[PDB]
Design a binder for these strands. Sequence first.
RNA 1: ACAU
DNA 2: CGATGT
Length: 136
Amino acid sequence: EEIIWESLSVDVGSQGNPGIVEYKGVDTKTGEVLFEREPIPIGTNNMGEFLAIVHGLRYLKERNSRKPIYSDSQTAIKWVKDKKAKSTLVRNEETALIWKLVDEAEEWLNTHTYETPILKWQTDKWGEIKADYGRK
RNA sequence: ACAU
DNA sequence: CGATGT
Ligand SMILES: [K+]
Ligand SMILES: [K+]
Ligand SMILES: [K+]
Ligand SMILES: [Mg+2]
Ligand SMILES: [Mg+2]
């Protein structure tokens, strides 16, 4: 603790895992939805969590914002730190879209800089992250 | 185990 | 109950 209220919170939503994946980012303080990705027909939870963080980085950089990003995903936070999404999802025609987006997110990380702190949302202490989809 |  | 991850 405590929550850094001046921040952006992101989360994934899915129908199946693997399954249809979407994500959104919200203002932690107000819950205002700031971006939402169009559903991707097949992906994993962790790919979506990773894309959500990287999109948040790009969103904040474009707006000259130094706010931190909260994510509840230990996995995706590490993948962003490493600049490498170590997903097990098969690469085939059905998964080509998500894998293109993941590849492109890695490429952006490898060609840009940021100081944005990427923080673990402490669900056990604080309840669900403010960007949660309410599907569980 | 822990995080989803 | 199933799956994705460190
Ligand atoms: K949910
Ligand atoms: K959660
Ligand atoms: K497991
Ligand atoms: Mg999540
Ligand atoms: Mg959630």
